[PDB]
Design a protein around this nucleic acid. Structure first.
Ligand SMILES: Cc1cn([C@H]2C[C@H](O)[C@@H](COP(=O)(O)NP(=O)(O)OP(=O)(O)O)O2)c(=O)[nH]c1=O
Ligand SMILES: [Cl-]
Ligand SMILES: [Mg+2]
Ligand code: NI
Length: 417
DNA sequence: AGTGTGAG
DNA sequence: ATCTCACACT
């Protein structure tokens, strides 16, 4: 149950090269041939952001060497990418997924699912008899097939898993996970049938393990990670690959303890971890290296902030007053469009406008931030309000010159009510 | 409460 | 992602 962190059934669904698939649905000639999606940029034909798996075999990567490669491009608006098409496809899939169990949309192409309830309901409604392997055509059970080889090995491991599953104990963690994988198999089948899109999934007891499991067998495949498989999986799992350990905390763990893999954290005591990383982080690390994590999947859905920004690196850095005013207006117009849709869809209005900037030479993400009331959904008014609070923040008193220059402009609406 | 951190 | 959004922290 909770002592061993097997209290829930969590899944992570991530679309395989989502943007590529969205383009392939519109232009058929691109569906089963190596292609990519570019943003029109005069350097190299434009930067690549989404690459199909077919092209990855040739060594093609995102951010040329596959002459057959076909290209599709993102519409551009106000100097940045326009992702409306993708947001609409994301919403489509999310609505389809919400039918099988409640979800937490985590990004434009992936979402967590809490199947605990659905798994309980499914074991009851089920006769109570066994689960045939035919319900898991694309499920991999991690670590088991120990002791054409791609396919089939999966089926042997699946057979050993099913042959060792509890039959009578309906609260058996492994059984709950197996049923969760069945439900995910159905969910993905429905998604493909109704949209044509393929995706991958991870099934485990918490968000961290579900996210890690999803990437174990991509694409169009799903992986089940049991509590018993956690030690082996962590034995050579880079610390920085765990959700929330990708930044300074993870690097700090590596440097202070002189370790690289998650499983090595098992050798330290809870008191040791608290004495080196603090009470909260020490306990979190102690349980996570053992496969235990409790972050709940939250259906809550309306956003707490709505905003947009744009970066101007190096040469492009905003130098004149005219430039900063124009880009603030562009940002406020995009903001107005989105806030308008927000108010139409959720009957709420933003009461605060946050303005943030970054000056060339500053290592921090943002050089400063100020705020002001957001009374009217007027791009022109908002542009002047943001400009007014940030305008005195300039060193050059020389006219027609902004000093220091700006390398980033950010506008954000919050405090909804 | 604004700053800093982290995911995707 | 070579942008949007969440939230922990005296
Ligand atoms: C990580 C990342 C994603 N994206 C965009 C393009 C992807 O289609 C979209 C989905 O992000 P992802 O889930 O991280 N990667 P993917 O879905 O495209 O590919 P896959 O899951 O590894 O097969 O986000 C970038 O433009 N730059 C990036 O660095
Ligand atoms: Cl903010
Ligand atoms: Mg993906
Ligand atoms: Ni004006």
């Amino acid at each position: 149950h909770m002592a061993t962190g097997q209290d829930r059934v969590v899944a992570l669904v991530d679309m395989d090269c989502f943007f590529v698939q969205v383009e392939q649905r519109q232009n058929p000639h691109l569906r089963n041939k190596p292609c990519a999606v570019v943003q029109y940029k005069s350097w190299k034909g434009g930067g690549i952001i989404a690459v199909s798996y077919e092209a990855r075999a040739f060594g093609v990567t995102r951010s040329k060497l596959c002459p057959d490669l076909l290209l599709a491009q993102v519409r551009e608006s106000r100097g940045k990418a326009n992702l409306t098409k993708y947001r609409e496809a994301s919403v489509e899939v999310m609505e389809i997924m919400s039918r099988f169990a409640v979800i937490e949309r985590a990004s434009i192409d992936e979402a967590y699912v809490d199947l605990t309830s659905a798994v309980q309901e499914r074991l009851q409604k089920l006769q109570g008899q066994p689960i045939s392997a035919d319900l898991l055509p694309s499920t991999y059970i991690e670590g088991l097939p120990q002791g054409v080889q791609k396919e089939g090995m999966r089926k042997q491991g699946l057979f050993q898993w099913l042959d060792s599953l509890q039959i009578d104990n309906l609260t058996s963690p492994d059984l709950q996970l197996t049923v969760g994988a069945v439900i995910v198999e159905e969910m993905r089948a429905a998604i493909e049938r109704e949209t044509g899109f393929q995706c991958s999934a991870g099934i485990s007891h918490n968000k961290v393990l579900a996210k890690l499991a999803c990437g174990l067998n991509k694409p169009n495949r799903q992986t089940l990670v049991s509590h018993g498989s956690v030690p082996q999986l962590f034995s050579q799992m880079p610390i920085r690959k765990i959700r929330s350990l990708g930044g300074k905390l993870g690097a700090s763990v590596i440097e202070i303890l002189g370790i690289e893999y998650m499983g090595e954290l098992t050798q330290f005591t809870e008191s040791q971890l608290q004495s080196h990383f603090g009470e909260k982080n020490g306990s979190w690390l102690y349980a996570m290296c053992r496969g235990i994590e409790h972050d709940p999947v939250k259906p809550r859905q309306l956003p707490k902030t709505i905003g947009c920004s744009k970066n101007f690196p190096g040469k492009t850095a905003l130098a004149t007053r005219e430039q900063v005013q124009w880009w603030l207006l562009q940002l406020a117009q995009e903001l107005e469009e989105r806030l308008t849709k927000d108010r139409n869809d959720n009957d709420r209005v933003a009461t605060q406008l946050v303005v943030s900037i970054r000056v060339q030479g500053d290592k921090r993400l943002s050089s400063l931030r100020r705020c002001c009331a957001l009374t009217r959904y007027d791009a022109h008014k908002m542009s002047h309000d943001a400009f007014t609070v940030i305008k005195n923040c300039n060193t050059s008193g020389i006219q027609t010159e902004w000093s220091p220059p700006l390398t980033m402009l950010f506008l954000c609406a919050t405090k909804f009510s």
